[PDB]
Amino acid sequence: QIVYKPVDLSKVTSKCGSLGNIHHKPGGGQVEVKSEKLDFKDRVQSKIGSLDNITHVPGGGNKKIETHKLTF
Amino acid sequence: QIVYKPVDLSKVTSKCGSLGNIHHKPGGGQVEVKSEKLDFKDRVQSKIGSLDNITHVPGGGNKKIETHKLTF
Amino acid sequence: QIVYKPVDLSKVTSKCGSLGNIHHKPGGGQVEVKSEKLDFKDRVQSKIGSLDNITHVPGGGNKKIETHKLTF
Amino acid sequence: QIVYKPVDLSKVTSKCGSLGNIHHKPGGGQVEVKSEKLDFKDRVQSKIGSLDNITHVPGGGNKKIETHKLTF
Amino acid sequence: QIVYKPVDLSKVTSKCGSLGNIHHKPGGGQVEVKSEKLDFKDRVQSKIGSLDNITHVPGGGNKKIETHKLTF
Amino acid sequence: QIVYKPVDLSKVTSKCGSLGNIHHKPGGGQVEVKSEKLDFKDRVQSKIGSLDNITHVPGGGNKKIETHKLTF
């Protein structure tokens, strides 16, 4: 008699990219008089209090190769 | 007699990209008099208090290859 | 008699990328009179109080190769 | 001429009670053979690996009393 | 001439009770053979791996009293 | 001419109770054979690997009393 009962009970997780929490609070203080004068003239690039979150995940893949043979 | 009963009970999860929470609160402070003057003339790029979230996931795939043979 | 009963009870986790929490609070202080004059003229790149979070994950993949053979 | 323009720009916050994070991981280790025999017979009180979080806040109230008078 | 124009721009917040995160993961470890035998007979109280969160907030109230008079 | 323009730009915060993070990891080690025999007979009180977090906040209140009078 032969019994062939291999059991895959496994658990696999991938968690990839921007996982953590971001808190961005620019200008959260106290001021009496606030004045901003912006003069931008030629080919200017500007970020003021902005948030860019850029995420690339080519990875994070799960791969199982499993071979079962019984030869009698 | 032969019994061939391999069992795949496994669990596989992929979680890929922007997973975390974003909190963006620009300008949330206290001000009495606030003034802004913006003068932008030629090929200016500006972000003020804006949020960009860019997510690319070519990955995060799950792949199973499983071969079963019994030869008697 | 033969019994062939290997059990994969394994647990595998990948956690890859920006895992930690970010707190960015520029300008959170106390001031009476605040004035800003910005004059940007020619091919200027500028960041003021802005947040860039850039995450690349080509890794963080999980791979299982498992071969089972019983030859009688 | 009289101008009566007192300005309340104030910000008030109360944050009272269980503010912090609790992480409770009883039994998170590695064991080959684990056995537990519990025999509790008369007026026994028992906690095993349980979490009680009890919060009472009679406080944390915010109170403003403000009186404005102009007598001419 | 008289102008009576007091301004309340104020912000008031109460946040009272169980504010923080609870993570309770009893039994998250690794065991080969696990056995538990429980025999409880008379007026026994038991908690095993359970979570109680009890919150009482008689407080956390906001109260504003504001009086305005102009007498001419 | 008279101008009466006191400005309240104040910021007030109360943060009261259990503020800090708790990490409780009982039994996180390595053992081959673990056995526990508990026999509790008469009016026993027992805590094993349990977490009690008890918070009382009758305080943490914010109070403003402000009086403005102009007599002409």
Residue numbers in the entry:
A (entry chain C), B (entry chain A), C (entry chain D), D (entry chain F), E (entry chain B), F (entry chain E): 307 to 378
Task: Show sentences the authors wrote.
Residues 297–391 (using the numbering of the longest human brain tau isoform) constitute the proteolytically stable core of paired helical filaments (PHFs) from the brains of individuals with Alzheimer’s disease. Here we use time-resolved cryogenic electron microscopy to study the in vitro assembly of recombinant truncated tau (amino acid residues 297–391) into paired helical filaments of Alzheimer’s disease or into filaments of chronic traumatic encephalopathy. At later time points, the first intermediate amyloid disappears and we observe many different intermediate amyloid filaments, with structures that depend on the reaction conditions. At the end of both assembly reactions, most intermediate amyloids disappear and filaments with the same ordered cores as those from human brains remain.
The first reaction was carried out in the presence of magnesium chloride for forming PHFs, whereas the second contained sodium chloride for forming CTE filaments. From 180 min, we observed multiple types of filament in the PHF reactions. As is the case of the Alzheimer fold, these protofilaments formed a turn of a β-helix at residues 337–356. However, whereas the Alzheimer fold is C shaped, the ordered cores of most protofilaments at 180 min adopted a more elongated, J-shaped conformation. In the different filament types, the J-shaped protofilaments packed against each other in different ways. Among J-shaped and C-shaped protofilaments, the opposing β-strands comprising residues 305–320 and 365–380 hardly changed their conformation, confining all differences to the β-helix turn and its surrounding residues. We observed two main types of J-shaped protofilament, as well as several other minority types of J-shaped protofilament. Earlier J-shaped protofilaments tend to be straighter, whereas the β-helix turn in later J-shaped protofilaments turns inwards, towards the rest of the protofilament. This change in orientation of the β-helix turn is reflected in a distinct conformation of the 332PGGG335 motif. In the PHF reaction, some earlier intermediate filaments also showed a similar extra density.
